[PDB]
Amino acid sequence: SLLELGKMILQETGKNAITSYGSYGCNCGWGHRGQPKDATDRCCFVHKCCYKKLTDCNHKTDRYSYSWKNKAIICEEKNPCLKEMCECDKAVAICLRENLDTYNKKYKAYFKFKCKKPETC
Ligand SMILES: CCCCCCCCCCCC(=O)O
């Protein structure tokens, strides 16, 4: 669920997920995908594409089990779909942390309506 996603992003990036990524670029947070503005935004593009494959569960509302042990995310979910959801989330948290070097506050509250049509997943 969004609960787990936000906890993973805070643990890896050190940033509040809604404030920093809830409206970042053309792909992070609310809305749909678009042409990424930078690397942080490409992370969220990949994340949303990763979510489209989850037909047997709900990425928004269904919670799953995971641990923050030794500064690393471990998915401890046995439900197959919720397991894929956890790995989708884990991937974006790690990806965003890796691109903290090029994170720019200008994209923080992006006007997502002017975003260009996204490429296919
Ligand atoms: C625990 C706090 C709840 C935050 C959950 C939403 C996460 C922020 C949205 C941006 C993540 C992304 O799209 O890559």
Helices (H) and strands (E) in the chain, counts: 4, 2
Which residues share a beta bridge with 73? 68
Please tell me which residue in 32, 38, 41, 47 is annotated as part of the active site.
47
**Helix or strand or coil: residue 86?**
helix
Experimental technique used? X-ray
CATH architecture, domain 1-121: Up-down Bundle (1.20)
- Residue-level length of the chain: 121
Q: What is the C-alpha separation between 73 and 70, in angstroms, rounded?
A: 9
CB-ligand 1 contact for 112 (6 Å cutoff): no
* CB 6 near ligand 1, within 6 Å: yes
* Tokens standing for residue 34: 């678009």
Quick check: 97 and 13 in contact, CB under 8 A? yes
Helical segments of the chain, H only = 2-13, 17-21, 39-52, 80-98
Sign of CA dihedral 46, 84, 110, 17: negative
For ligand 1, whether the C-beta of 21 sits within 6 Å is yes
